[PDB]
Amino acid sequence: KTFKEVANAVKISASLMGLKINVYIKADKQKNGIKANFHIRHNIEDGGVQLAYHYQQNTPIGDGPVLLPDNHYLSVQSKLSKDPNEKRDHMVLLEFVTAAGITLKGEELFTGVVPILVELDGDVNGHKFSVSGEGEGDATYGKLTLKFICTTGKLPVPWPTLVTTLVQCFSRYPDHMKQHDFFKSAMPEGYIQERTIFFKDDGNYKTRAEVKFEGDTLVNRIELKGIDFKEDGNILGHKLEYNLLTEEQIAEFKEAFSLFDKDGDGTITTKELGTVMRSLGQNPTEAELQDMINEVDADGDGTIDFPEFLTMMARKMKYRDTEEEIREAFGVFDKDGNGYISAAELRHVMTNLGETDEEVDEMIREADIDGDGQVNYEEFVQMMT
Numbered sequence: 001k002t003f004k005e006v007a008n009a010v011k012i013s014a015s016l017m018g019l020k021i022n023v024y025i026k027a028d029k030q031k032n033g034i035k036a037n038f039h040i041r042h043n044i045e046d047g048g049v050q051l052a053y054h055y056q057q058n059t060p061i062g063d064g065p066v067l068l069p070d071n072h073y074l075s076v077q078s079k080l081s082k083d084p085n086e087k088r089d090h091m092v093l094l095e096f097v098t099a100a101g102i103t104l105k106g107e108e109l110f111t112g113v114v115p116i117l118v119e120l121d122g123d124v125n126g127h128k129f130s131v132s133g134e135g136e137g138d139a140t141y142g143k144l145t146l147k148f149i150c151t152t153g154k155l156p157v158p159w160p161t162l163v164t165t166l167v168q169c170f171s172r173y174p175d176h177m178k179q180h181d182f183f184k185s186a187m188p189e190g191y192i193q194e195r196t197i198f199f200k201d202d203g204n205y206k207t208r209a210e211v212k213f214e215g216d217t218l219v220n221r222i223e224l225k226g227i228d229f230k231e232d233g234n235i236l237g238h239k240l241e242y243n244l245l246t247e248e249q250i251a252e253f254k255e256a257f258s259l260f261d262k263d264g265d266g267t268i269t270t271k272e273l274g275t276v277m278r279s280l281g282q283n284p285t286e287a288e289l290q291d292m293i294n295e296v297d298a299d300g301d302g303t304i305d306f307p308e309f310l311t312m313m314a315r316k317m318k319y320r321d322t323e324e325e326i327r328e329a330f331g332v333f334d335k336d337g338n339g340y341i342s343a344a345e346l347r348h349v350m351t352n353l354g355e356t357d358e359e360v361d362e363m364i365r366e367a368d369i370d371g372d373g374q375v376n377y378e379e380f381v382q383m384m385t
């Protein structure tokens with residue numbers, strides 16, 4: 001087992017304990033609708049991550065009865081691409097969205113393929129823009145395919161920052177979760193979707209959208225206002241990467257999986273998760289272990305099977321680690337907090353994980369760029385590439 005593999009297991013253990021990557025939906029009885037919260041992580045060019053914290057409210061347009069759900073989440077897989085024959089400033093989007101997080105007439109409008117139209121008018125720090133999108137949704141699979149054009153010329157913000165704003169009625173709700181689909185229940189009259197999106201260390205978007213059928217088209221009409229942005233920051237300075245899977249990356253995912261799946265049955269149970277977390281000096285309760293599993297447990301059986309684990313690792317490719325998360329993983333090895341992983345510290349962790357003085361020294365010696373016999377933060381980072 002390499003230093004890289006053990007560090008990777010340590011990061012995934014902390015991710016399973018703490019990372020919240022889903023779209024969390026709650027009933028809002030006062031508004032006869034829902035609230036949601038989630039965050040997005042945008043990759044900054046030449047390294048680092050820009051966090052976008054989303055707060056959402058949805059309220060029905062009509063007086064008809066709607067479904068108010070139990071707490072649950074949407075799990076989003078999105079791919080951004082370019083149309084090689086498109087000269088206009090554009091974004092091609094493919095998304096698969098599935099509801100989970102509940103353990104084991106409007107819906108009728110979504111059993112086939114539904115044309116979509118999106119229209120956005122934006123104003124960020126007084127830079128105005130418009131976007132038009134079209135494509136189709138196939139809620140049977142939770143599938144969206146859209147192409148968007150900036151109709152005003154050059155988009156003054158990165159396309160990725162508009163993805164969440166630019167139709168959750170296309171989400172796939174599993175059969176055991178159909179009563180919890182507010183979005184389809186509000187159709188065809190539709191819903192108002194409002195957000196505030198906080199770009200950490202930068203300004204915020206405020207959005208208001210009407211999502212409803214106009215004939216047999218699902219239309220999303222949006223207004224967006226951004227205030228308090230930095231003209232040279234990551235958004236108005238265009239410093240976010242547009243978009244982002246090797247056999248090697250998959251094999252690394254599997255090596256991590258097999259450290260949790262100690263009985264080799266192809267699933268990770270609360271007991272198995274607990275065993276690893278206790279070995280890294282955490283002490284989660286049964287209820288907390290069940291909540292960790294729930295974040296990843298697509299089928300709601302109460303375990304993480306192998307494909308569930310690989311889906312989570314694939315989705316985590318859009319959630320680049322923050323300094324604070326990497327410092328936390330470093331800290332599991334750097335138990336005395338002095339900024340240096342000693343051979344003693346690496347042996348303590350390796351031992352606790354059930355993996356010779358020469359083998360430990362050898363591991364240090366590989367990561368130890370500066371030759372001091374210890375691993376500092378910068379060397380830890382470099383070792384994980």
Ligand SMILES: [Ca+2]
Nearest residue numbers: 261263265267
């Ligand atoms: Ca197992």
Ligand SMILES: [Ca+2]
Nearest residue numbers: 297301303305
């Ligand atoms: Ca499962």
Ligand SMILES: [Ca+2]
Nearest residue numbers: 334336338340
């Ligand atoms: Ca230390």
Ligand SMILES: [Ca+2]
Nearest residue numbers: 368372374375
């Ligand atoms: Ca060193």
